Design a protein around this ligand. Sequence first.
Ligand code: LVJ
Ligand code: LVJ
Ligand code: LVJ
Ligand code: GSH
Ligand code: GSH
Ligand code: GSH
Lengths: 161, 161, 161
Amino acid sequence: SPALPAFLLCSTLLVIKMYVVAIITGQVRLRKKAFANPEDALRHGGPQYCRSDPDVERCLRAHRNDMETIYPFLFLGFVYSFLGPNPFVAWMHFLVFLVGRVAHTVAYLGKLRAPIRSVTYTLAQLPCASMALQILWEAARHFLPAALRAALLGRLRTLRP
Amino acid sequence: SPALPAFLLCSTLLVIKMYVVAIITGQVRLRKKAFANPEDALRHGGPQYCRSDPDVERCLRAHRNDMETIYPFLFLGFVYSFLGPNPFVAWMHFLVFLVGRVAHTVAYLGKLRAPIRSVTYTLAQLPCASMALQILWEAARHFLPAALRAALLGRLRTLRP
Amino acid sequence: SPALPAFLLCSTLLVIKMYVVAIITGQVRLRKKAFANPEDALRHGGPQYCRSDPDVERCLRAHRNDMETIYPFLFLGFVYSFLGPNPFVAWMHFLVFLVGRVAHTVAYLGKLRAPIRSVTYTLAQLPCASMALQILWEAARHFLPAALRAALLGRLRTLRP
Ligand SMILES: Cn1c(Nc2c(Cl)ccc(CNC(=O)C(C)(C)C)c2Cl)nc2cc(C(=O)NCC(F)(F)F)c(OCC(C)(C)O)cc21
Ligand SMILES: Cn1c(Nc2c(Cl)ccc(CNC(=O)C(C)(C)C)c2Cl)nc2cc(C(=O)NCC(F)(F)F)c(OCC(C)(C)O)cc21
Ligand SMILES: Cn1c(Nc2c(Cl)ccc(CNC(=O)C(C)(C)C)c2Cl)nc2cc(C(=O)NCC(F)(F)F)c(OCC(C)(C)O)cc21
Ligand SMILES: N[C@@H](CCC(=O)N[C@@H](CS)C(=O)NCC(=O)O)C(=O)O
Ligand SMILES: N[C@@H](CCC(=O)N[C@@H](CS)C(=O)NCC(=O)O)C(=O)O
Ligand SMILES: N[C@@H](CCC(=O)N[C@@H](CS)C(=O)NCC(=O)O)C(=O)O
């Protein structure tokens, strides 16, 4: 599986990128003084700082969207890299996703004009869809009758004794 | 691992189902005109459409609940299928979960009467619990003293030189 | 991979712990009578019980934070245990995380004084960062030129025919 290291690289970078969104999120909570919890606010000013803020809310939306897209890629990308895909093709799947999700986060936290984020979400979903269909195709091919699987490899049953 | 393809099928369908919840969610945002972001709203009417809506909120709750149930199944189901379970039994685990989570989403987005969703959540959690205990049992059996592991396979230590 | 069973143990316990947060969450919804859905509230009193509550909100924050930390550990910890790390070192990575995340949840649901939770989140992130860098290092070492990889193993190219 020559694809696997490329996948390990792109997926681990994406986790780290997610960890970074987390760090940005806490820093925004500190600067804006907007804590989710009473106990936090007490330690950083008083109860009035237990409140929401638009920038904190945005950071969480970005993080949640990562959870809805990157966690599936971790699973799909893994299984897919054990399916002997073309190595260049697999690199492309992984690079369209990494660059797309990195761009996604920049478009969210940078608040760029619509629909720039919305497009980067869709483009990044493209290789994920592709890997999913391919995995489904291979899983489904496993359960075909053996007579059909043989016919597809050029072998009809012999009537000869 | 004859169980693995069945698992790949059920788990990949579940990811796709999650992708579909995502698509429904965006479509509800468009129709109701309820965007999470100022920049989105500007592109689709004006700032007044940066607002929440009950149907959008529901879609997100459904999606989040998928994240809390399906992502663990992706991990548990994978490891479990490498534990040589009975193939029919493993199919049942995977089918009770797939059908249960599909039913769950129908009960949420369809807004069926309580407690229909709540039941489908619980029934679907059943095979997940089962796989988890089994994985824990196998992981734990690995760390037993060797003398106890041998005794359980009928072998007591010999006093003979 | 002697590390793998230790990982299976710590990771499956963490999933179960997450399932427990889920159960606590529903029980808090019942006692406080704070349901996310109109249909739920009808079955447990009336529409006035379709409302938020501070304790329900906290439970969800705890659960979400698990999703942002434990799901990556499931992926990182798996890959890492196939990297032949020292078995004791790997046990430490897995135990600092398990104990840290268990402590995290106690600090959230128990509402302990700031910044006790915030510290336990950070300490638990430590072995995750470590595993990630190590995975990145191994994935990156794979793509170095072969001449550099050989030099690092003591082999320069021979000019001899
Ligand atoms: C006041 N305080 C907070 N406050 C806080 C609170 Cl109460 C609520 C929310 C945030 C925002 N969070 C963040 O910015 C993260 C970096 C944790 C993601 C923060 Cl920063 N977090 C801490 C976190 C730590 C911390 O994690 N220290 C590093 C250690 F864990 F290794 F000890 C810490 O260590 C202090 C000491 C004396 C123990 O070194 C103090 C901390
Ligand atoms: C106006 N607009 C939006 N608006 C939008 C905004 Cl700003 C906010 C929220 C939503 C709801 N999202 C959805 O319904 C999803 C399908 C993306 C999940 C939407 Cl639909 N999303 C787009 C998304 C795309 C898009 O994804 N196009 C397909 C492409 F990515 F391949 F280019 C797009 O392409 C236009 C063009 C000219 C580039 O083809 C336009 C788009
Ligand atoms: C009234 N009710 C509810 N209500 C409800 C509603 Cl409508 C909304 C939110 C909650 C809180 N959820 C929880 O506490 C969970 C344990 C499900 C996490 C609850 Cl408890 N959930 C149920 C859940 C079940 C349930 O899961 N039963 C066990 C079964 F699935 F195996 F049938 C159930 O079974 C009743 C019967 C007659 C079918 O046994 C009834 C239930
Ligand atoms: N959970 C998403 C489902 C749809 C989705 O993923 N949309 C993309 C493209 S518009 C996105 O960037 N969503 C922003 C978000 O989740 O905050 C939502 O609420 O929008
Ligand atoms: N995060 C869940 C934890 C409990 C749970 O998963 N409950 C099931 C059965 S009542 C459910 O369908 N929850 C609906 C949801 O998460 O919106 C919640 O807030 O209810
Ligand atoms: N999503 C997190 C990102 C930062 C984070 O994980 N912080 C840790 C340490 S302060 C935490 O316990 N967060 C509490 C939470 O997510 O409710 C947030 O909103 O704070």
